[PDB]
Design a protein around this ligand. Structure first.
Ligand SMILES: C[C@H](C[C@@H](C[C@H](C[C@@H](C[C@@H](CCN1CCCC1=O)N1CCCC1=O)N1CCCC1=O)N1CCCC1=O)N1CCCC1=O)N1CCCC1=O
Ligand SMILES: COc1cc(CCNC(=O)c2nc(-c3cccc(C(F)(F)F)c3)[nH]c(=O)c2O)ccn1
Ligand SMILES: [Mn+2]
Ligand SMILES: [Mn+2]
Length: 180
């Protein structure tokens, strides 16, 4: 069963983040033992979402990603019913209470252009904000409004490149890149 990538995920990411990624994957019919690359991807996505939510003020953000499906939909419903934003057709990652909008965080191994295009093609209601980070240090946000200040985003990018380096050191990076 076991594989180097799984052990690396378990040693590289926080135990709560690993448990959350595992729960989400099982809930969505995936297997972290076997789909180890997706395992790493959802751990990374979770960490990015958490760091981003940490980048604002105390009450700045409401974290949607990481919750189970029913509760996540419950909280976006409460947010829509108290603010007036439209219901996103698909579950986002965050809600900005200062900018009053949902945020879709993406982490990509390819050019941010392609991935942002996909995310803007699925999200029909253009109300929800979109913010892509890449594993090379590029980033791309909707209307060039990158929400957080420079230092928080740079912290995210540094960590992303650290993960990429740790993967390449174990010869795990080529497989990870040629999997998205
Ligand atoms: C709130 C709680 C769980 C949170 C999880 C998330 C973890 C956060 C912890 C930070 C601070 N630090 C600082 C010291 C080390 C550490 O880890 N970070 C950020 C980086 C990695 C990480 O681990 N956060 C964010 C708010 C506070 C908190 O703890 N989550 C999980 C998904 C939804 C959510 O809000 N809840 C709420 C009820 C259920 C539950 O489990
Ligand atoms: C969570 O586990 C899952 C989830 C689903 C559907 C729900 N998903 C999201 O909400 C979502 N998912 C990703 C993502 C997940 C795995 C891999 C990758 C990629 F990096 F390889 F592209 C991206 N990224 C986001 O930004 C994002 O919002 C289905 C199966 N498993
Ligand atoms: Mn999400
Ligand atoms: Mn996302």
């Amino acid at each position: 069963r076991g594989s180097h990538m799984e052990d690396f995920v378990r040693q590289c990411f926080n135990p709560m983040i690993v448990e959350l990624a595992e729960k989400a994957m099982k809930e969505y019919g995936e297997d972290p033992k076997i789909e180890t690359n997706k395992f790493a991807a959802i751990c990374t996505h979770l960490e990015v979402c958490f760091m981003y939510s940490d980048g604002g003020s105390k009450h700045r953000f409401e974290i949607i990603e990481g919750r189970d499906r029913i509760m996540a939909w419950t909280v976006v419903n409460s947010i829509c019913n108290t603010t007036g934003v439209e219901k996103p057709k698909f579950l986002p990652d965050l809600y900005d209470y200062k900018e009053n909008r949902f945020i879709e965080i993406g982490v990509t191994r390819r050019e941010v252009h392609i991935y942002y295009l996909e995310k803007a093609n699925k999200i029909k209601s253009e109300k929800t904000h979109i913010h892509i980070f890449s594993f090379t240090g590029e980033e791309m946000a909707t209307k060039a409004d990158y929400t957080l200040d420079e230092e928080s985003r740079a912290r995210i990018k540094t960590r992303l490149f650290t993960i990429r380096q740790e993967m390449a050191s174990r010869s795990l990076w080529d497989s990870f890149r040629q999997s998205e």
